[PDB]
């Protein structure tokens, strides 16, 4: 319209985008800054980078861009692109994007009295410390620091407004505990003037159903399956195969776990402790199985069972576990030959009895170690899992 | 020509590209918006991003860009590049691209009476919720929300038109169901003026032939092979090794499947339930194999067969399964020797009888568990596979 | 020089880069379009994207860029950069690049009579359907569709010229069959004016030496090795281990091939059919091995061999394979004791004979299944490989 | 300063950056072109690209940018940024980057006498054919082609200078042999105008210590370990597991090497034929092991051993291999039973004496195949490794 | 404000952003350069690049941009954007980014006396040589080389200020040691003028808790478990299975380690030496196991034990290891038929004695090799781990 054209022509006369729009030069310009979170796109733990979608909110007052609406009956607000108006240089300090600024430059909407709004959208990638000590039951706090780059405290007065989460779209993996903000003032080695900034601390909680049913339960099941090696009879020579293949499955699971975790040396993660405990238990079970097989195949005349071992294994541990241990001239020549055969059979019977005793001792050791290893596995698993904080509330929120 | 040159020179006289091309400033400007889909290029479930190829269609009326064809006989339409004509700032709200605007700026074609058309092509990436509860028999609805950033409802009148899919190129993995659209207007915390927007909901269905052939058939066949352990004689030791190798194969298949799936905790996927059921069945098979092996290698004099075990296995189940039950002084001194030899043979005889009885019990247990596990696996796989909605439709559309 | 400076000053006088350089505003402007292929950079089958290196070739005639060479001695050609003279807005419709234009804007060479040439180099990513039905003996036709975006048939008359391949650099994996071109005009839902375009079809063939030697032959030897299970004697307990290990290796190969191929449900790939056949054969071999082991370890007193089973296995198949089937009062007490031992030995001998007969039947079944499986796998592999079209051409070209 | 301010004001007066700075328009402009390499950042064989760090060097003479130093004391050189003075359009033809140009436009430094110098830096990404025939002992020649895009020899005649490698930073994998340059002069069919271009050939030699220590040596060790199947006694049923597990390790190594290799079908690479030979050797070892196991477990009465098998294995191969051949009325009825028992024992001993011959034949075949396979693997490995032309150079430079 | 509006109008009057802002053109302009480090974002060992977050700091003095604060009250500083005032062209030579300059162009702040400050932020990708010989216990020195591109001695002399690390954010992987810098002069053959540059050497120490808990310890544990083959009785067919399964775990773990190393042939890394040592240890263990099994299953009448072998393995080593050495006519017919049985039993007994001697010799060999390998592996591991510098500091810092 003619009035719009006239206003647009009159508004830009003698205007200078480099100038701060203040009536008095020695007074700071107040700028209100706020943030609107729409979605959390990614939390990369290996690279420790948070990718979110946010709209910035910058509102201030322009002294020159004012007019009387009576003289311009139709128009009420105007709009200016980048480069034709003065804008604050609000930047994210801890950005991780290759381009340090990742905001789409939209229009600035101007009031009939000079008020200016600026709502640029953006996919922001920032670097925040990520703690994996209590993984997967962890809670993360990532900071977002915004501030003016070249305007101090005596030039641009930054004020904070509470963040907006009405448009938030819930994420599948991460809950949103919340985003509080605070305004701080700092001194930099460059200069001798305070530089205010606004920091929003996004606090999220990880939902644990996926990891719990994909990574924890299989490990428990395989660890419990590794205990069947103590139930197999020694004659069926397939004990080392069982133990070593369970160990192989466990170590490939360990590699799968480690491929998604950053190589930080602050502390030992909970799942790392879990996998170490499972590794140790399976290795000890393999060692015990080797000892049991050594007992089972003992050479009957190789040696004698020591008295202490005989007592401990035969009369005490069997009592504990309620196990019962099993069990005419020509005539003389024929006589001595059949006597020789009978003596040979008697010696064979004694050797068999000794072998049976050794086999029973092996079975007793096997059962005792089965009981001990089951108790160890249960106690270690329960302790490691319940050591983490907020585990109860994570379980209650996710699995129930 | 001279007419074209003069018309271009005249049409830009006192033209401000910063004003809405309207005759009456109070009245809004109507802009017709539409979309033209060309190809659905990618659907990333892990990152939950939809990548498509679309042409936007914007149509409006410019009041200043009008002329008489009689004065310029040759010229009928003109073309204005980016930055020299007023264009709506319509963009995608939910964009998952590093640059928030992924459209290609092209010329605007202008009528002889002020009708401007704008057809910018683009490769658009958006973030939409991906539901994997019914993988692979799932249907996805992804929303594209377009709107003007800085023009409210009192200055811009966004009117929806119907999407065009006449040039759509079918995809080899996703079968397009449709793409309806709807207009809405919302209130934002920024301001006190309604803002309209247009949302197009792409509804698509996944073709399941590839997944059904490459992922479900191998698992079914491998689980069926896992049931061969109950048909394997216990004399040859190959049962534990076979079962554990099948377990390893299931583990690698599970990791391969989980490599491509989102780590969400909204619900337990159907494929995850299927894999868990198969894992449990194979683990129970290994446990039963251990029990049968322990029964078969039972030492003869190490105990007596319980009456309950006898009455459960040796008679009842054998009847039900129709398995037949398999069954001068020297003239003195030589006599006790031959009696000793005969008695030793007799003792060996009834020991062998007891061992044969135990082996028959083991065979009975093997047959029982074979039947039970076959029934269980068939029921479980059929129920899990058929529990998903629109599964018969997917089968009848892909396989037949 | 002075003449060059004068000419450059005169040419840009009153020149508008927005108008079509035509003497008459009604007649269309003829533009000659051509392509120069340099290399086939990539063919992503999984994403279905063709990346090529090409020089476009646009030629037209400009009415305003003319001068008399006599008045400007020495200068015979001028050059104008991007944004100072009119250029066609020719784009690639099938672009899969994040930016719809992947051309490098070079200079425009202008004649002494107004003939303008424009050869912008570029690396182009386009979307074409990659058929994988006959992997790896397949031929691909990928389309590159170029056209003007905002100029209709009444303004820009597009013309086609034969593509140039004189600078083609041969690719190590693809053989260029050819690159024909066609010109068509289509009607779009936007407007009521035809829009001409030029489509170039790149037809190329895949060389099948790498795949044949790395992926098909090793599977053939693995399948052949799987047949050795029908030669191991049953006493050596390794048949199940061999079969299951071969099956695991085949599954690993299956995952390796599956991770490069698209997830399309359009058709069943030939390689998928071939691997499915190999896996089915191996599984059937494992089942047959289980049956043979069950026959071999038969209880001597379990059950008599059926008459039909005897008359078949021990006679018909036995003759077919030309294998022959193997084959004083104390004196009374002494006699009665010796007779019992003799009778026990006789019973043992008869049981041994029965066991030997069962083992011979198992061997017969083993050899019969060996012959059957070898024939079946040979014919299946030959048929699947030979079913592909141009298989003979591919093998001849890539091997001989 | 005022002097350089006045100089800058005077120089750009009536200056056209589109004009070729030559005093005489008929004469062409001499441009000296050179390259300075700093680093071979990457050599990708799968994608066949070369990434290097390069400073270009362009030198020419300007006719209008000249001044007298006496009139402007203290000013000897000036500097002009991109887009304000004429610059050559030299480009790299065989580029492999999404943007065709990969240079960083720096300033142009200018003489007091008009000689212009220009040194843009860049991370250049070109495409060259990477031969892989003699991998790892391969030498690569990659060509960089530079030329003007729209200037001929009667407008701009390119010259040469030797490439500078004084600042080259040695790479840890590739050894630089040289960077020779060739100046090509192409003629068209229309015109006698030369067209000069400059091509630089980077010659690189791969340092093979890493590959020879991580791929060749472990494969040799595992293949040698695979030869122990001919040393294991057949009684311990573990002759098949060794071979199958070694074959699985070989397949894993083949997958590892195939992950990094291009899919070109130009020739069979050295590492590929090496792994094929090892595959064949292992498979033949498994077949021989099956034959030996068949010999060992022969039935005692399943058929007389062939005369040829006797006369060869038991005599000739035994002589060669220096292995020796290992090795009242009731009283009559009592007599009959004792004779029966003795005859049974005689028959058992005679039958047992037959199996010893089969076991000895198995041992003979085992040792003979051991020596044969040792010779085979040694010959194949030595020949395949020494077939490369650079083997001696590589082993004398890297390992020594 | 009117004062700053007038000041901004006055400052840019006759200002040329091309000339060097110095009062006397014969004197160099002093520029102070430094940087502030914020974070070490990534250290890529495979690609040999270093990603850091850095704020440059360049300060100088401008002769023209000066004013008296009395005439413009309330205005103390001004801000100019890129392209409106002169700035140094300081770049980083070691850049590894696609765009050579990765800095972000912010405003330049000018005081009342003409002092100019410029602090652009950036994420810089440098290319520094990474020495991986002592990995994990590694210390890295990475150089950043900053300098002007087209300014020399009497044009611009660069001066150093100390780097600032007061804002450094600790990394969980690398422990920063220091960032010492150096100002260096390069002299040309042209003329006596220094060319200054500034080099900053970042020294980082890797924190080795993650690697020591994920690579070294599990390798030690599995290698120790590989020694259990020397405790398994030979009667259980699992020695080869144990050894080769441990070998498989070792080789897959080696492949994982090689996935993260760079393919540099300058030196052999510590972890590679350790893995090779474990390879040889396990292979020799397998060979010894084969020899022991060969001794165990020796034919009783296939050859007497050599005298040397007897004296070595039955007296000397047995006393060393303290192993006990393990454990009417018819009557004539009866006599003859009984003597046969008696003599056969005696022959069986003596053959059993020979077999027992062979088995005891095998056990002695097994124990000897157990002790030898147990010493060897400990010695090799301790030596390899302790052969690295700063190992004691690394453990005492990371672990304790
Ligand atoms: C404008 O800013 C500069 C910042 O360097 C001031 O220069 C410093 O001023 C302090 C105060 O006397 C001195 O201690 C420093 O030695 C100065 N630095 C240098 C390199 O000279 C400068 O004084 C300020 N000018 C005005 C009018 O405020
Ligand atoms: C044929 N052109 C290219 C695609 C749409 C169509 C068009 C028509 C009018 C204005 N812009 C584009």
Tab-separated table of C-alpha atoms in Angstrom, chain A residues 103-337:
chain	number	residue	atom	x	y	z
A	103	UNK	CA	20.806	-19.888	13.806
A	104	UNK	CA	18.668	-19.313	10.737
A	105	UNK	CA	18.482	-15.551	10.217
A	106	UNK	CA	14.795	-14.637	10.088
A	107	UNK	CA	13.064	-11.253	10.062
A	108	UNK	CA	12.906	-8.809	12.960
A	109	UNK	CA	9.328	-7.754	13.720
A	110	UNK	CA	8.959	-4.163	14.913
A	111	UNK	CA	6.147	-2.623	16.976
A	112	UNK	CA	4.351	0.649	16.377
A	113	UNK	CA	6.324	2.057	19.334
A	114	UNK	CA	9.801	0.639	18.645
A	115	UNK	CA	9.632	-2.769	20.331
A	116	UNK	CA	11.534	-5.418	18.364
A	117	UNK	CA	11.226	-9.205	18.589
A	118	UNK	CA	13.635	-11.773	17.165
A	119	UNK	CA	12.768	-15.487	17.120
A	120	UNK	CA	15.439	-17.382	15.169
A	121	UNK	CA	15.163	-21.180	15.055
A	122	UNK	CA	18.030	-23.603	15.181
A	123	UNK	CA	19.445	-27.105	15.398
A	124	UNK	CA	22.048	-26.469	18.095
A	125	UNK	CA	24.976	-28.808	18.741
A	126	UNK	CA	26.755	-28.121	22.029
A	127	UNK	CA	29.495	-29.790	24.058
A	128	UNK	CA	28.390	-30.877	27.533
A	129	UNK	CA	30.088	-33.216	29.986
A	130	UNK	CA	28.336	-36.596	30.034
A	131	UNK	CA	28.760	-38.844	33.075
A	132	UNK	CA	28.466	-42.573	32.388
A	133	UNK	CA	29.418	-43.750	35.889
A	134	UNK	CA	25.868	-44.934	36.663
A	135	UNK	CA	25.070	-46.089	33.127
A	136	UNK	CA	22.382	-46.972	32.167
A	137	UNK	CA	20.605	-45.502	35.253
A	138	UNK	CA	22.228	-42.078	34.871
A	139	UNK	CA	20.829	-38.538	34.970
A	140	UNK	CA	22.497	-35.885	32.818
A	141	UNK	CA	22.900	-32.120	33.247
A	142	UNK	CA	24.052	-30.296	30.106
A	143	UNK	CA	24.720	-26.557	30.061
A	144	UNK	CA	23.856	-24.018	27.365
A	145	UNK	CA	25.685	-20.696	27.725
A	146	UNK	CA	24.499	-17.695	25.705
A	147	UNK	CA	25.864	-14.179	25.742
A	148	UNK	CA	26.884	-11.136	23.777
A	149	UNK	CA	30.317	-11.350	22.190
A	150	UNK	CA	31.435	-7.716	21.871
A	151	UNK	CA	29.043	-5.846	24.202
A	152	UNK	CA	29.927	-5.429	27.867
A	153	UNK	CA	27.875	-4.668	30.934
A	154	UNK	CA	27.903	-0.901	30.394
A	155	UNK	CA	26.556	-1.314	26.839
A	156	UNK	CA	24.094	-4.230	26.688
A	157	UNK	CA	22.189	-5.314	29.807
A	158	UNK	CA	21.128	-8.939	29.391
A	159	UNK	CA	18.044	-10.042	31.323
A	160	UNK	CA	16.784	-13.602	31.669
A	161	UNK	CA	13.282	-14.958	31.123
A	162	UNK	CA	12.098	-18.443	32.019
A	163	UNK	CA	12.325	-21.081	29.305
A	164	UNK	CA	9.280	-22.392	27.447
A	165	UNK	CA	8.483	-26.111	27.276
A	166	UNK	CA	4.853	-25.951	26.121
A	167	UNK	CA	5.887	-27.063	22.626
A	168	UNK	CA	8.161	-29.866	23.840
A	169	UNK	CA	7.822	-33.181	21.992
A	170	UNK	CA	8.689	-36.076	24.351
A	171	UNK	CA	11.703	-38.147	23.347
A	172	UNK	CA	11.657	-41.930	23.318
A	173	UNK	CA	14.881	-42.427	25.272
A	174	UNK	CA	15.257	-39.370	27.524
A	175	UNK	CA	12.870	-37.893	30.048
A	176	UNK	CA	12.974	-34.144	30.674
A	177	UNK	CA	13.435	-33.407	34.367
A	178	UNK	CA	13.597	-29.744	33.455
A	179	UNK	CA	15.516	-26.714	32.283
A	180	UNK	CA	16.239	-23.938	34.806
A	181	UNK	CA	18.265	-20.881	33.929
A	182	UNK	CA	20.505	-18.386	35.699
A	183	UNK	CA	22.234	-15.125	34.813
A	184	UNK	CA	25.908	-14.746	35.700
A	185	UNK	CA	28.519	-12.013	35.339
A	186	UNK	CA	32.142	-12.821	34.546
A	187	UNK	CA	35.503	-11.167	33.972
A	188	UNK	CA	37.692	-12.087	31.005
A	189	UNK	CA	41.440	-11.676	30.595
A	190	UNK	CA	40.874	-9.624	27.426
A	191	UNK	CA	39.318	-6.620	29.059
A	192	UNK	CA	38.361	-4.888	32.313
A	193	UNK	CA	34.571	-4.840	32.002
A	194	UNK	CA	32.090	-7.502	33.173
A	195	UNK	CA	30.420	-9.599	30.472
A	196	UNK	CA	27.011	-10.983	31.504
A	197	UNK	CA	25.740	-14.314	30.225
A	198	UNK	CA	22.687	-16.552	30.601
A	199	UNK	CA	23.028	-20.290	31.247
A	200	UNK	CA	20.258	-22.885	30.886
A	201	UNK	CA	20.968	-26.255	32.520
A	202	UNK	CA	18.944	-28.970	30.790
A	203	UNK	CA	18.486	-31.920	33.160
A	204	UNK	CA	17.334	-35.214	31.632
A	205	UNK	CA	16.770	-38.750	32.903
A	206	UNK	CA	17.411	-41.822	30.758
A	207	UNK	CA	14.615	-44.350	30.275
A	208	UNK	CA	15.996	-47.796	31.028
A	209	UNK	CA	13.537	-50.324	29.563
A	210	UNK	CA	15.432	-50.817	26.292
A	211	UNK	CA	18.845	-51.394	27.864
A	212	UNK	CA	17.346	-53.381	30.730
A	213	UNK	CA	15.632	-55.911	28.487
A	214	UNK	CA	18.294	-55.947	25.741
A	215	UNK	CA	21.590	-55.995	27.628
A	216	UNK	CA	21.060	-56.804	31.319
A	217	UNK	CA	18.609	-59.725	31.171
A	218	UNK	CA	20.594	-61.619	28.478
A	219	UNK	CA	23.750	-61.283	30.583
A	220	UNK	CA	21.975	-62.655	33.661
A	221	UNK	CA	20.543	-65.524	31.622
A	222	UNK	CA	23.908	-66.504	30.126
A	223	UNK	CA	25.625	-66.220	33.514
A	224	UNK	CA	23.007	-68.532	35.024
A	225	UNK	CA	23.405	-70.906	32.073
A	226	UNK	CA	27.140	-71.049	32.801
A	227	UNK	CA	26.243	-72.792	36.085
A	228	UNK	CA	24.936	-75.918	34.329
A	229	UNK	CA	28.558	-77.051	33.931
A	230	UNK	CA	28.390	-78.149	37.574
A	231	UNK	CA	25.420	-80.438	36.855
A	232	UNK	CA	26.838	-82.344	33.878
A	233	UNK	CA	28.295	-85.762	34.732
A	234	UNK	CA	32.027	-85.987	34.158
A	235	UNK	CA	31.695	-88.972	31.801
A	236	UNK	CA	29.973	-86.822	29.161
A	237	UNK	CA	33.118	-84.944	28.217
A	238	UNK	CA	31.453	-81.661	27.242
A	239	UNK	CA	32.212	-79.409	30.224
A	240	UNK	CA	35.136	-77.334	28.935
A	241	UNK	CA	33.183	-76.740	25.724
A	242	UNK	CA	30.245	-75.344	27.705
A	243	UNK	CA	32.392	-73.117	29.901
A	244	UNK	CA	34.634	-71.744	27.171
A	245	UNK	CA	31.751	-71.023	24.798
A	246	UNK	CA	29.829	-69.179	27.516
A	247	UNK	CA	33.020	-67.178	28.065
A	248	UNK	CA	33.179	-66.387	24.335
A	249	UNK	CA	29.569	-65.189	24.345
A	250	UNK	CA	30.324	-63.024	27.379
A	251	UNK	CA	33.359	-61.398	25.775
A	252	UNK	CA	31.556	-60.611	22.523
A	253	UNK	CA	28.829	-59.051	24.690
A	254	UNK	CA	31.559	-57.032	26.420
A	255	UNK	CA	32.852	-55.742	23.085
A	256	UNK	CA	29.315	-54.826	22.010
A	257	UNK	CA	28.901	-52.890	25.264
A	258	UNK	CA	32.236	-51.098	24.883
A	259	UNK	CA	31.606	-50.004	21.293
A	260	UNK	CA	29.023	-47.425	22.492
A	261	UNK	CA	30.868	-45.935	25.477
A	262	UNK	CA	33.449	-43.119	25.543
A	263	UNK	CA	37.039	-43.802	26.550
A	264	UNK	CA	37.032	-41.649	29.682
A	265	UNK	CA	39.131	-42.444	32.752
A	266	UNK	CA	37.197	-40.568	35.453
A	267	UNK	CA	35.598	-43.657	37.005
A	268	UNK	CA	34.720	-47.286	36.305
A	269	UNK	CA	31.191	-47.595	34.851
A	270	UNK	CA	28.597	-49.786	36.523
A	271	UNK	CA	28.166	-52.073	33.526
A	272	UNK	CA	31.948	-52.433	33.291
A	273	UNK	CA	31.960	-53.623	36.906
A	274	UNK	CA	29.100	-56.008	36.092
A	275	UNK	CA	30.900	-57.526	33.112
A	276	UNK	CA	34.161	-57.837	35.047
A	277	UNK	CA	32.351	-59.733	37.805
A	278	UNK	CA	30.716	-62.068	35.284
A	279	UNK	CA	34.068	-62.671	33.563
A	280	UNK	CA	35.737	-63.534	36.866
A	281	UNK	CA	32.922	-65.883	37.895
A	282	UNK	CA	32.990	-67.771	34.587
A	283	UNK	CA	36.784	-68.076	34.664
A	284	UNK	CA	36.725	-69.403	38.220
A	285	UNK	CA	34.035	-71.897	37.208
A	286	UNK	CA	36.252	-73.113	34.356
A	287	UNK	CA	39.181	-73.536	36.762
A	288	UNK	CA	37.016	-75.496	39.206
A	289	UNK	CA	35.752	-77.698	36.372
A	290	UNK	CA	39.356	-78.434	35.382
A	291	UNK	CA	40.122	-79.447	38.975
A	292	UNK	CA	37.026	-81.672	39.082
A	293	UNK	CA	37.998	-83.403	35.834
A	294	UNK	CA	41.498	-83.886	37.246
A	295	UNK	CA	39.957	-85.612	40.268
A	296	UNK	CA	37.631	-87.761	38.148
A	297	UNK	CA	40.342	-89.248	35.905
A	298	UNK	CA	42.768	-90.034	38.728
A	299	UNK	CA	44.973	-93.040	38.062
A	300	UNK	CA	43.996	-95.721	40.623
A	301	UNK	CA	47.579	-96.769	41.431
A	302	UNK	CA	49.097	-93.334	40.798
A	303	UNK	CA	48.884	-92.356	44.448
A	304	UNK	CA	46.836	-92.374	47.628
A	305	UNK	CA	44.173	-89.897	48.670
A	306	UNK	CA	45.552	-87.750	51.519
A	307	UNK	CA	43.909	-88.217	54.898
A	308	UNK	CA	42.796	-84.588	55.223
A	309	UNK	CA	41.212	-84.565	51.762
A	310	UNK	CA	39.580	-87.935	52.437
A	311	UNK	CA	38.003	-86.703	55.677
A	312	UNK	CA	36.889	-83.301	54.394
A	313	UNK	CA	35.372	-84.581	51.153
A	314	UNK	CA	33.970	-87.925	52.292
A	315	UNK	CA	32.611	-87.682	55.834
A	316	UNK	CA	31.917	-83.945	56.303
A	317	UNK	CA	30.790	-82.483	52.974
A	318	UNK	CA	28.695	-85.553	52.162
A	319	UNK	CA	27.025	-85.199	55.566
A	320	UNK	CA	26.335	-81.531	54.807
A	321	UNK	CA	24.882	-82.201	51.350
A	322	UNK	CA	23.197	-85.507	52.317
A	323	UNK	CA	25.077	-87.727	49.858
A	324	UNK	CA	25.807	-91.412	50.480
A	325	UNK	CA	28.928	-93.036	49.071
A	326	UNK	CA	28.085	-95.923	46.711
A	327	UNK	CA	28.715	-99.477	47.842
A	328	UNK	CA	45.969	-136.022	40.049
A	329	UNK	CA	49.377	-134.564	39.044
A	330	UNK	CA	47.630	-132.562	36.316
A	331	UNK	CA	45.078	-131.190	38.791
A	332	UNK	CA	47.571	-128.921	40.569
A	333	UNK	CA	48.408	-127.028	37.375
A	334	UNK	CA	44.746	-126.302	36.632
A	335	UNK	CA	44.346	-125.247	40.264
A	336	UNK	CA	47.172	-122.723	40.182
A	337	UNK	CA	46.102	-121.322	36.803
